[PDB]
């Protein structure tokens, strides 16, 4: 889920049923969105959508995301410091 810390935030999500091209992470103002969609056609569809609010002292430009080989997606960013 979402973890706020003193100098950063981080979101960690299990996405093991999705390949990278089926995943999208977006920042809109102080909202982070994560979407996953997998379809194939004898028809299978699965999707998810998560939204979290982030504190206003996070610069959206410094927000990054990575996907571990075990299917854990991380989204994180520093908060303004010093």
């Amino acid at each position: 889920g979402m973890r706020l810390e003193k100098d950063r935030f981080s979101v960690n999500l299990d996405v093991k049923h999705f390949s990278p091209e089926e995943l999208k992470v977006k920042v809109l103002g102080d909202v982070i969105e994560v979407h996953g969609k997998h379809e194939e056609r004898g028809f299978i569809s699965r999707c998810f959508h998560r939204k979290y609010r982030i504190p206003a002292d996070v610069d959206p430009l410094t927000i990054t995301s990575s996907l571990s080989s075990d299917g854990v997606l991380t989204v994180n960013g520093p908060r303004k410091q010093v």
Binding site: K26, V27, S65, L67
Partner: peptide
């Protein structure tokens, strides 16, 4: 609306 690149980890 920043789409954020999901990188390898």
């Amino acid at each position: 609306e920043r789409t954020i690149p999901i990188t390898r980890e």
